[PDB]
Protein backbone atom coordinates (compact mmCIF):
# COMPACT_ATOMS: atom_id res chain seq x y z
CA UNK A 1 0.00 0.00 0.00
CA UNK A 2 1.93 2.99 -1.36
CA UNK A 3 -1.06 4.95 -2.66
CA UNK A 4 -3.08 3.93 -5.72
CA UNK A 5 -3.78 6.44 -8.47
CA UNK A 6 -6.56 4.07 -9.53
CA UNK A 7 -7.88 1.99 -6.60
CA UNK A 8 -8.74 -0.89 -8.94
CA UNK A 9 -5.68 -0.98 -11.18
CA UNK A 10 -2.52 -2.67 -9.94
CA UNK A 11 0.83 -0.92 -9.78
CA UNK A 12 3.41 -1.65 -12.50
CA UNK A 13 6.31 -3.85 -11.47
CA UNK A 14 9.07 -1.43 -12.43
CA UNK A 15 7.57 1.21 -10.09
CA UNK A 16 8.86 -0.30 -6.86
CA UNK A 17 7.74 2.43 -4.46
CA UNK A 18 11.22 3.58 -3.37
CA UNK A 19 10.58 6.83 -5.31
CA UNK A 20 8.82 9.78 -3.66
CA UNK A 21 5.36 10.52 -5.00
CA UNK A 22 5.01 6.96 -6.29
CA UNK A 23 1.34 6.08 -6.81
CA UNK A 24 1.66 3.42 -9.53
CA UNK A 25 0.78 5.82 -12.37
CA UNK A 26 2.26 4.99 -15.79
CA UNK A 27 -0.46 3.72 -18.15
CA UNK A 28 1.51 4.28 -21.36
CA UNK A 29 4.59 2.55 -19.92
CA UNK A 30 7.06 5.34 -20.66
CA UNK A 31 9.36 4.47 -17.72
CA UNK A 32 9.47 0.69 -18.19
CA UNK A 33 13.19 0.96 -18.94
CA UNK A 34 14.97 1.90 -15.67
CA UNK A 35 17.13 4.36 -17.62
CA UNK A 36 13.99 6.06 -18.95
CA UNK A 37 12.72 6.11 -15.37
CA UNK A 38 15.98 7.66 -14.16
CA UNK A 39 15.87 10.40 -16.81
CA UNK A 40 12.16 11.15 -16.35
CA UNK A 41 12.61 11.57 -12.57
CA UNK A 42 14.94 14.50 -13.22
CA UNK A 43 12.60 15.79 -15.93
CA UNK A 44 9.70 15.79 -13.47
CA UNK A 45 11.76 17.57 -10.80
CA UNK A 46 12.98 20.35 -13.09
CA UNK A 47 9.63 20.78 -14.85
CA UNK A 48 7.85 20.82 -11.50
CA UNK A 49 10.28 23.33 -10.00
CA UNK A 50 10.06 25.70 -12.97
CA UNK A 51 6.27 25.35 -12.94
CA UNK A 52 6.16 26.18 -9.22
CA UNK A 53 8.20 29.36 -9.68
CA UNK A 54 6.27 30.22 -12.83
CA UNK A 55 2.81 29.80 -11.31
CA UNK A 56 3.91 31.92 -8.34
CA UNK A 57 5.36 34.66 -10.54
CA UNK A 58 2.19 34.62 -12.66
CA UNK A 59 -0.45 34.53 -9.92
CA UNK A 60 1.00 36.39 -6.92
CA UNK A 61 2.01 39.65 -8.67
CA UNK A 62 -1.41 39.76 -10.35
CA UNK A 63 -3.52 39.25 -7.22
CA UNK A 64 -1.45 41.89 -5.42
CA UNK A 65 -2.15 44.15 -8.41
CA UNK A 66 -5.90 43.45 -8.42
CA UNK A 67 -6.08 44.07 -4.66
CA UNK A 68 -4.34 47.43 -4.98
CA UNK A 69 -1.07 47.08 -3.08
CA UNK A 70 1.16 47.10 -6.19
CA UNK A 71 0.71 47.72 -9.93
CA UNK A 72 2.65 44.97 -11.72
CA UNK A 73 1.98 44.01 -15.37
CA UNK A 74 0.26 40.72 -16.09
CA UNK A 75 2.33 37.64 -16.84
CA UNK A 76 1.46 37.65 -20.55
CA UNK A 77 1.85 41.44 -20.87
CA UNK A 78 5.08 41.62 -18.85
CA UNK A 79 7.12 40.84 -21.97
CA UNK A 80 5.88 43.78 -24.05
CA UNK A 81 6.93 46.18 -21.27
CA UNK A 82 10.10 48.27 -21.51
CA UNK A 83 13.14 47.29 -19.45
CA UNK A 84 16.64 48.62 -18.86
CA UNK A 85 18.06 46.28 -21.53
CA UNK A 86 17.04 45.13 -24.98
CA UNK A 87 14.99 41.93 -24.82
CA UNK A 88 17.55 40.41 -27.19
CA UNK A 89 20.34 41.15 -24.72
CA UNK A 90 18.27 39.61 -21.92
CA UNK A 91 17.87 36.51 -24.09
CA UNK A 92 21.61 36.13 -24.69
CA UNK A 93 22.40 36.57 -20.99
CA UNK A 94 19.85 33.92 -20.03
CA UNK A 95 21.06 31.57 -22.77
CA UNK A 96 24.75 31.77 -21.81
CA UNK A 97 24.07 31.35 -18.09
CA UNK A 98 21.76 28.37 -18.58
CA UNK A 99 24.05 26.88 -21.23
CA UNK A 100 26.56 26.67 -18.37
CA UNK A 101 24.28 25.62 -15.50
CA UNK A 102 22.05 23.08 -17.23
CA UNK A 103 25.05 21.32 -18.78
CA UNK A 104 26.75 21.17 -15.37
CA UNK A 105 23.60 19.55 -14.00
CA UNK A 106 23.51 17.28 -17.06
CA UNK A 107 27.03 16.02 -16.33
CA UNK A 108 25.77 14.91 -12.91
CA UNK A 109 22.76 13.17 -14.49
CA UNK A 110 24.96 11.05 -16.77
CA UNK A 111 27.87 10.62 -14.35
CA UNK A 112 26.87 11.17 -10.70
CA UNK A 113 29.14 13.21 -8.46
CA UNK A 114 31.33 14.47 -11.31
CA UNK A 115 30.60 18.21 -10.94
CA UNK A 116 30.48 18.63 -7.16
CA UNK A 117 33.52 20.92 -6.90
CA UNK A 118 34.09 24.49 -8.03
CA UNK A 119 36.53 24.61 -10.98
CA UNK A 120 37.52 28.21 -10.17
CA UNK A 121 38.02 27.77 -6.42
CA UNK A 122 39.41 24.28 -5.87
CA UNK A 123 37.97 24.13 -2.35
CA UNK A 124 34.30 24.83 -1.49
CA UNK A 125 32.88 21.64 -3.00
CA UNK A 126 29.48 20.00 -2.71
CA UNK A 127 28.93 17.08 -0.32
CA UNK A 128 27.71 13.81 -1.81
CA UNK A 129 23.95 13.76 -2.32
CA UNK A 130 21.53 12.26 -4.83
CA UNK A 131 20.82 13.22 -8.43
CA UNK A 132 18.31 16.06 -8.43
CA UNK A 133 19.13 17.00 -4.81
CA UNK A 134 22.50 18.80 -4.71
CA UNK A 135 23.74 19.52 -1.21
CA UNK A 136 26.11 22.16 0.09
CA UNK A 137 25.52 25.76 -0.93
CA UNK A 138 22.26 24.73 -2.64
CA UNK A 139 20.83 23.87 0.82
CA UNK A 140 21.93 26.78 3.03
CA UNK A 141 19.23 26.41 5.70
CA UNK A 142 20.39 22.77 6.12
CA UNK A 143 16.91 21.26 5.94
CA UNK A 144 16.47 17.49 5.92
CA UNK A 145 16.00 16.06 2.39
CA UNK A 146 13.78 13.10 3.29
CA UNK A 147 10.52 11.43 2.36
CA UNK A 148 7.35 13.51 2.75
CA UNK A 149 9.64 16.51 2.22
CA UNK A 150 10.63 15.15 -1.20
CA UNK A 151 7.09 13.84 -1.67
CA UNK A 152 5.69 17.31 -0.97
CA UNK A 153 8.15 18.81 -3.46
CA UNK A 154 6.94 16.45 -6.19
CA UNK A 155 3.30 16.92 -5.19
CA UNK A 156 3.53 20.72 -5.33
CA UNK A 157 5.36 20.40 -8.64
CA UNK A 158 2.62 18.23 -10.12
CA UNK A 159 -0.13 20.62 -9.03
CA UNK A 160 1.88 23.61 -10.27
CA UNK A 161 2.44 21.93 -13.64
CA UNK A 162 -1.31 21.39 -13.89
CA UNK A 163 -1.66 25.00 -12.73
CA UNK A 164 0.58 26.27 -15.53
CA UNK A 165 -1.36 24.11 -17.98
CA UNK A 166 -4.52 25.78 -16.70
CA UNK A 167 -3.10 29.31 -16.84
CA UNK A 168 -1.98 29.16 -20.48
CA UNK A 169 -5.18 27.56 -21.80
CA UNK A 170 -7.43 29.83 -19.74
CA UNK A 171 -5.67 33.03 -20.84
CA UNK A 172 -5.99 31.83 -24.44
CA UNK A 173 -9.77 31.43 -24.37
CA UNK A 174 -10.78 33.85 -21.59
CA UNK A 175 -8.52 36.77 -22.58
CA UNK A 176 -7.63 37.78 -19.00
CA UNK A 177 -5.42 36.43 -16.23
CA UNK A 178 -5.84 33.65 -13.66
CA UNK A 179 -6.97 35.80 -10.73
CA UNK A 180 -9.46 37.63 -12.96
CA UNK A 181 -10.83 34.23 -14.00
CA UNK A 182 -11.23 33.23 -10.35
CA UNK A 183 -13.04 36.48 -9.51
CA UNK A 184 -15.34 36.08 -12.52
CA UNK A 185 -16.07 32.51 -11.40
CA UNK A 186 -16.53 33.43 -7.72
CA UNK A 187 -19.14 36.07 -8.59
CA UNK A 188 -21.44 33.48 -10.18
CA UNK A 189 -20.03 29.95 -10.56
CA UNK A 190 -23.23 28.45 -12.00
CA UNK A 191 -23.15 30.99 -14.87
CA UNK A 192 -19.38 31.64 -15.23
CA UNK A 193 -17.91 28.25 -16.15
CA UNK A 194 -15.86 26.89 -19.05
CA UNK A 195 -19.33 25.94 -20.31
CA UNK A 196 -20.23 29.64 -20.47
CA UNK A 197 -16.81 30.84 -21.68
CA UNK A 198 -16.85 28.85 -24.93
CA UNK B 1 -20.52 -16.35 -27.96
CA UNK B 2 -16.75 -16.42 -27.56
CA UNK B 3 -16.57 -17.85 -31.09
CA UNK B 4 -18.79 -15.01 -32.32
CA UNK B 5 -16.51 -12.42 -30.73
CA UNK B 6 -13.50 -14.19 -32.27
CA UNK B 7 -15.16 -13.87 -35.68
CA UNK B 8 -15.74 -10.14 -35.16
CA UNK B 9 -11.99 -9.77 -34.54
CA UNK B 10 -11.05 -11.19 -37.96
CA UNK B 11 -9.20 -8.89 -40.34
CA UNK B 12 -12.03 -7.90 -42.75
CA UNK B 13 -14.67 -7.30 -40.06
CA UNK B 14 -12.25 -5.35 -37.86
CA UNK B 15 -11.23 -3.39 -40.96
CA UNK B 16 -14.83 -2.54 -41.90
CA UNK B 17 -15.80 -1.45 -38.38
CA UNK B 18 -12.57 0.54 -38.03
CA UNK B 19 -12.85 2.14 -41.47
CA UNK B 20 -16.58 2.80 -41.04
CA UNK B 21 -15.93 4.62 -37.77
CA UNK B 22 -13.06 6.45 -39.48
CA UNK B 23 -15.17 7.36 -42.52
CA UNK B 24 -18.00 8.67 -40.34
CA UNK B 25 -15.61 10.78 -38.26
CA UNK B 26 -13.96 12.41 -41.28
CA UNK B 27 -17.40 13.04 -42.79
CA UNK B 28 -18.59 14.88 -39.67
CA UNK B 29 -15.32 16.83 -39.50
CA UNK B 30 -15.79 17.98 -43.10
CA UNK B 31 -19.45 18.61 -42.22
CA UNK B 32 -18.70 21.03 -39.36
CA UNK B 33 -15.55 22.34 -41.09
CA UNK B 34 -16.09 22.03 -44.85
CA UNK B 35 -13.52 22.96 -47.48
CA UNK B 36 -10.51 24.39 -45.60
CA UNK B 37 -7.31 24.36 -47.65
CA UNK B 38 -5.28 25.51 -44.62
CA UNK B 39 -4.94 25.22 -40.85
CA UNK B 40 -6.76 28.46 -39.92
CA UNK B 41 -6.34 28.43 -36.13
CA UNK B 42 -2.62 29.38 -36.28
Amino acid sequence: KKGEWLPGLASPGYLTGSLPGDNGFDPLGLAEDPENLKWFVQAELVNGRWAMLGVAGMLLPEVFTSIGIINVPKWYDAGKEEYFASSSTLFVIEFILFHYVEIRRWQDIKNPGSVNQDPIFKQYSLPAGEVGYPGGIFNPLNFAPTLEAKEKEIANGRLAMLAFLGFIIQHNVTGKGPFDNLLQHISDPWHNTIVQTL
Amino acid sequence: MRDLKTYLSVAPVASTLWFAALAGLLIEINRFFPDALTFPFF
Binding site: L28, G29, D33, W39 | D35, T38, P40
Partner: protein
Protein backbone atom coordinates in the same frame (compact mmCIF):
# COMPACT_ATOMS: atom_id res chain seq x y z
CA UNK C 1 3.05 39.49 -52.83
CA UNK C 2 5.23 36.37 -52.99
CA UNK C 3 6.16 34.90 -56.39
CA UNK C 4 4.15 37.68 -58.04
CA UNK C 5 0.91 36.44 -56.47
CA UNK C 6 -1.79 38.74 -55.13
CA UNK C 7 -3.81 37.98 -51.97
CA UNK C 8 -7.24 36.56 -52.75
CA UNK C 9 -8.92 39.43 -50.91
CA UNK C 10 -7.36 41.75 -53.52
CA UNK C 11 -7.76 39.58 -56.63
CA UNK C 12 -10.59 40.42 -59.01
CA UNK C 13 -10.58 36.96 -60.60
CA UNK C 14 -11.14 35.45 -57.15
CA UNK C 15 -14.23 37.61 -56.61
CA UNK C 16 -15.41 36.94 -60.17
CA UNK C 17 -15.27 33.19 -59.52
CA UNK C 18 -17.40 33.66 -56.41
CA UNK C 19 -19.87 35.78 -58.39
CA UNK C 20 -20.14 33.42 -61.36
CA UNK C 21 -20.45 30.36 -59.09
CA UNK C 22 -23.24 31.93 -57.03
CA UNK C 23 -25.01 33.24 -60.14
CA UNK C 24 -24.79 29.77 -61.70
CA UNK C 25 -26.44 28.27 -58.61
CA UNK C 26 -29.06 31.02 -58.69
CA UNK C 27 -29.76 30.16 -62.33
CA UNK C 28 -30.53 26.63 -61.12
CA UNK C 29 -32.65 28.10 -58.31
CA UNK C 30 -35.14 30.03 -60.47
CA UNK C 31 -36.47 26.72 -61.83
CA UNK C 32 -37.85 25.70 -58.41
CA UNK C 33 -40.38 27.16 -55.99
CA UNK C 34 -39.26 29.34 -53.05
CA UNK C 35 -40.69 26.87 -50.51
CA UNK C 36 -39.29 23.81 -52.30
CA UNK C 37 -36.72 21.41 -50.86
CA UNK C 38 -34.41 21.79 -53.89
CA UNK C 39 -34.63 25.53 -53.22
CA UNK C 40 -33.45 25.21 -49.62
CA UNK C 41 -30.72 22.83 -50.82
CA UNK C 42 -29.47 25.27 -53.47
CA UNK C 43 -29.72 28.15 -50.99
CA UNK C 44 -27.63 26.16 -48.50
CA UNK C 45 -25.04 25.46 -51.21
CA UNK C 46 -24.91 29.19 -52.03
CA UNK C 47 -24.37 30.05 -48.36
CA UNK C 48 -21.72 27.31 -48.18
CA UNK C 49 -20.02 28.82 -51.24
CA UNK C 50 -19.96 32.31 -49.69
CA UNK C 51 -18.52 30.85 -46.48
CA UNK C 52 -15.78 29.00 -48.38
CA UNK C 53 -14.66 31.99 -50.45
CA UNK C 54 -14.78 34.33 -47.45
CA UNK C 55 -12.72 31.94 -45.31
CA UNK C 56 -10.07 31.55 -48.02
CA UNK C 57 -9.77 35.32 -48.43
CA UNK C 58 -9.72 35.95 -44.69
CA UNK C 59 -6.83 33.62 -43.76
CA UNK C 60 -4.34 35.28 -46.10
CA UNK C 61 -4.42 32.81 -48.98
CA UNK C 62 -2.49 33.97 -52.04
CA UNK C 63 -4.16 33.87 -55.45
CA UNK C 64 -2.64 33.63 -58.91
CA UNK C 65 -3.85 35.21 -62.13
CA UNK C 66 -6.46 32.41 -62.25
CA UNK C 67 -8.18 33.49 -59.02
CA UNK C 68 -7.40 30.18 -57.31
CA UNK C 69 -5.63 29.81 -53.93
CA UNK C 70 -1.97 28.91 -54.42
CA UNK C 71 -0.07 27.39 -51.50
CA UNK C 72 3.45 28.41 -50.46
CA UNK C 73 5.40 25.58 -48.84
CA UNK C 74 8.82 27.26 -48.67
CA UNK C 75 8.29 27.78 -44.94
CA UNK C 76 7.34 31.47 -45.04
CA UNK C 77 5.82 32.18 -41.63
CA UNK C 78 2.85 33.99 -43.21
CA UNK C 79 1.56 30.66 -44.59
CA UNK C 80 2.51 27.93 -42.10
CA UNK C 81 -1.15 26.91 -42.02
CA UNK C 82 -0.82 25.79 -45.65
CA UNK C 83 1.69 22.97 -45.12
CA UNK C 84 4.07 22.99 -42.15
CA UNK C 85 1.39 23.14 -39.46
CA UNK C 86 -0.89 20.47 -41.03
CA UNK C 87 2.23 18.49 -41.89
CA UNK C 88 3.35 18.39 -38.26
CA UNK C 89 -0.18 17.28 -37.40
CA UNK C 90 0.09 14.50 -39.98
CA UNK C 91 3.52 13.35 -38.79
CA UNK C 92 2.05 13.14 -35.29
CA UNK C 93 -0.81 10.96 -36.55
CA UNK C 94 1.39 8.85 -38.85
CA UNK C 95 3.93 8.21 -36.10
CA UNK C 96 1.03 7.28 -33.82
CA UNK C 97 -0.23 4.67 -36.31
CA UNK C 98 3.20 3.20 -36.96
CA UNK C 99 4.22 3.16 -33.30
CA UNK C 100 1.03 1.46 -32.12
CA UNK C 101 1.21 -1.16 -34.86
CA UNK C 102 4.87 -1.71 -33.98
CA UNK C 103 4.01 -2.13 -30.29
CA UNK C 104 1.39 -4.70 -31.31
CA UNK C 105 3.81 -6.71 -33.46
CA UNK C 106 6.39 -6.73 -30.65
CA UNK C 107 3.81 -7.91 -28.11
CA UNK C 108 2.64 -10.86 -30.24
CA UNK C 109 6.04 -11.88 -31.64
CA UNK C 110 6.55 -14.27 -28.70
CA UNK C 111 3.18 -16.02 -29.08
CA UNK C 112 2.99 -19.72 -29.94
CA UNK C 113 1.50 -18.81 -33.35
CA UNK C 114 2.29 -15.13 -34.00
CA UNK C 115 0.41 -15.39 -37.30
CA UNK C 116 -2.76 -16.21 -35.34
CA UNK C 117 -2.94 -12.74 -33.78
CA UNK C 118 -2.16 -11.10 -37.15
CA UNK C 119 -5.21 -12.45 -39.02
CA UNK C 120 -7.43 -12.44 -35.89
CA UNK C 121 -6.86 -9.18 -34.04
CA UNK C 122 -6.39 -9.26 -30.27
CA UNK C 123 -8.70 -6.31 -29.64
CA UNK C 124 -8.02 -6.17 -25.85
CA UNK C 125 -4.28 -5.94 -26.55
CA UNK C 126 -4.95 -3.39 -29.30
CA UNK C 127 -7.17 -1.21 -27.09
CA UNK C 128 -4.42 -1.18 -24.47
CA UNK C 129 -1.81 -0.10 -27.01
CA UNK C 130 -3.72 2.47 -29.10
CA UNK C 131 -3.05 5.21 -26.54
CA UNK C 132 0.72 4.69 -26.42
CA UNK C 133 0.95 6.60 -29.71
CA UNK C 134 -0.14 9.72 -27.82
CA UNK C 135 3.42 9.89 -26.46
CA UNK C 136 5.04 8.25 -29.50
CA UNK C 137 7.66 11.01 -30.14
CA UNK C 138 8.89 10.46 -26.58
CA UNK C 139 8.79 6.66 -26.38
CA UNK C 140 10.41 6.50 -29.82
CA UNK C 141 13.10 9.04 -28.95
CA UNK C 142 14.02 7.16 -25.78
CA UNK C 143 14.14 3.88 -27.70
CA UNK C 144 16.49 5.65 -30.12
CA UNK C 145 18.93 6.63 -27.36
CA UNK C 146 18.74 3.23 -25.62
CA UNK C 147 19.26 1.12 -28.74
CA UNK C 148 15.77 -0.40 -28.63
CA UNK C 149 14.35 1.00 -31.89
CA UNK C 150 16.72 -0.70 -34.36
CA UNK C 151 17.61 -4.39 -34.47
CA UNK C 152 21.35 -4.91 -34.03
CA UNK C 153 23.21 -6.22 -37.09
CA UNK C 154 20.54 -6.77 -39.76
Amino acid sequence: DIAGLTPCKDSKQFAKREKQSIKKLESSLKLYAPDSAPALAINATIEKTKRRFDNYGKQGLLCGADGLPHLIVSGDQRHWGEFITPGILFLYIAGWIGWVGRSYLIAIRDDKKPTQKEIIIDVPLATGLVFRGFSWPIAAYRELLNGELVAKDV
